[PDB]
Design a protein around this ligand. Structure first.
Ligand SMILES: CN1CC[C@]23c4c5ccc(O)c4O[C@H]2[C@@H](O)C=C[C@H]3[C@H]1C5
Lengths: 212, 222
């Protein structure tokens, strides 16, 4: 039941050096895991960059390199370019099957940091008449394109019935996302205070409302 | 130019079957290992398997050999994936990828990838969306106000959302769909001057081509 672990997200600036890592649940990564690195760019464009731990794929820019570092496989970008903003997947071989890590979103700062605009909407009266309630939290104009969203109802974090889209590009090249809280109408009626909390670059933006 | 094109995806019922094809151009396909990888919505890559040039060796993820058969036809320069007994968790984009083996025959990279073909497994019937207004709660003032449109529970994708029949376009944001209770939901928002709403009417228009429907929802204060 081998599991491959990567940083969820890293940020660097153009010209800097950044290293991404890749860990195995079986122990140290070795050359016998033949670590691969695959880059995902927008519109689901995948490209192999590194194979067999430290071989660049033919035609790949020299700023990409691979190595083992301690327990882990590593991808280093030495002199990052804005075009290197992308999701990077590592993949490790375990004798007879290949396992991908969860991917690292790499931001290479290509515009200023921008905090999210957050809007929280209550259920509509028309929806409530169907005995259902959906709260909607919209999140726009943020960069880097990484957020965490949490919901609270009368001080209770919601662990069932919340759903958040993965960030997607706006026409102005910032990012947007939406989050949903699904309740029954009776639940809506039985609670008072509702909050959507958006954390971006270590700061939380909170919007809340009170029913009725 | 090394180039791939996948086909054979689409909507299939649970327990149904389909065969995906990956056509390879620009290289001698009969000399390369070929692999299948997929990506469920919002998620990362999952390997499916790979097959060597003469098909004497196939490696596969153990959980999927029950459903999936990898094969190839070197005369057609094509890689195949037969999918049977399909399940909701098979909803994903499916990619083929070439295996490049380096000098020394002891290192590889998955160098070139196809653009992917989409498979959706669902028993949902065609379902038009329930469209609801998103208006601020009953109310402190700023110079702009953000309004919205909840497009709840439709099938299949897509819907098209406009504001005031296309006349409001700047600062409209229509968000990706989520899947809940086997139906799709998305939202759209628009920002207008506080002096404009609710004095002037703001309406979202939602069309669902598969239902041949198009509905309007005026955004009214709470
Ligand atoms: C993921 N997959 C790629 C192709 C293949 C392979 C690997 C490593 C080094 C190789 O040289 C190599 O070639 C084949 C096969 O011989 C053995 C394992 C498979 C595996 C890993």
């Amino acid at each position: 039941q081998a599991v491959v672990t990567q940083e969820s997200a890293l940020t660097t600036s153009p010209g800097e050096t950044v290293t991404l890592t890749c860990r195995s649940s079986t122990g140290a990564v070795t050359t016998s895991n033949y670590a691969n690195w695959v880059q995902e760019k927008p519109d689901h464009l995948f490209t192999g960059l590194i194979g067999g731990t430290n071989n660049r794929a033919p035609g790949v820019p020299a700023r990409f390199s691979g190595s083992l570092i301690g327990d882990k496989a590593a991808l280093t970008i030495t002199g990052a370019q804005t075009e290197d903003e992308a999701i990077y997947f590592c993949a490790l071989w375990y004798s007879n099957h290949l396992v991908f890590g969860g991917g690292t979103k790499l931001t290479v700062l290509g515009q200023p940091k921008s905090s999210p605009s957050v809007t929280l909407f209550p259920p509509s009266s028309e929806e409530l008449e169907t005995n259902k309630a959906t709260l909607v939290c919209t999140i726009t104009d943020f960069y880097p394109g990484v957020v965490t969203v949490d919901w609270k109802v009368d001080g209770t974090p919601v662990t069932q019935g919340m759903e958040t889209t993965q960030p997607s590009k706006q026409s102005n090249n910032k990012y947007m996302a939406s989050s949903y809280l699904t309740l029954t109408a009776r639940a809506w009626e039985r609670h008072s205070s509702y909050s959507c909390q958006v954390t971006h670059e270590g700061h939380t933006v909170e919007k809340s409302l009170s029913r009725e | 130019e090394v180039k791939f094109l996948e086909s054979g995806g689409g909507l299939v019922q649970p327990g149904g079957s389909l065969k995906l094809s990956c056509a390879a151009s620009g290289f001698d396909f009969s000399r390369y290992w070929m692999s299948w990888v997929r990506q469920a919505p919002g998620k990362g890559l999952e390997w499916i398997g790979e097959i060597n040039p003469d098909s004497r060796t196939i490696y596969c993820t153990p959980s999927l050999k029950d459903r999936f058969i990898i094969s190839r036809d070197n005369a057609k320069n094509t890689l195949y994936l037969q999918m049977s007994k399909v399940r909701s968790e098979d909803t994903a984009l499916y990619y083929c990828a070439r295996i490049w083996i380096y000098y020394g025959f002891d290192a590889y990279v998955m160098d070139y990838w196809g653009p992917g073909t989409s498979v959706t497994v669902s028993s949902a019937k065609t379902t038009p969306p329930s469209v609801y207004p998103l208006a601020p709660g009953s109310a402190q003032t700023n110079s702009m106000v953000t309004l919205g449109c909840l497009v709840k529970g439709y099938f299949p994708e897509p819907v098209t959302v406009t504001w005031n029949s296309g006349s409001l376009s700047s600062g409209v944001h229509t968000f990706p769909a989520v899947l809940q209770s086997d139906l799709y939901t998305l939202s759209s928002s628009v920002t207008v001057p506080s002096s404009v709403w609710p004095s002037e009417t703001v309406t979202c228009n939602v069309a669902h081509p598969a239902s041949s429907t198009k509905v309007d929802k005026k955004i009214v204060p709470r």
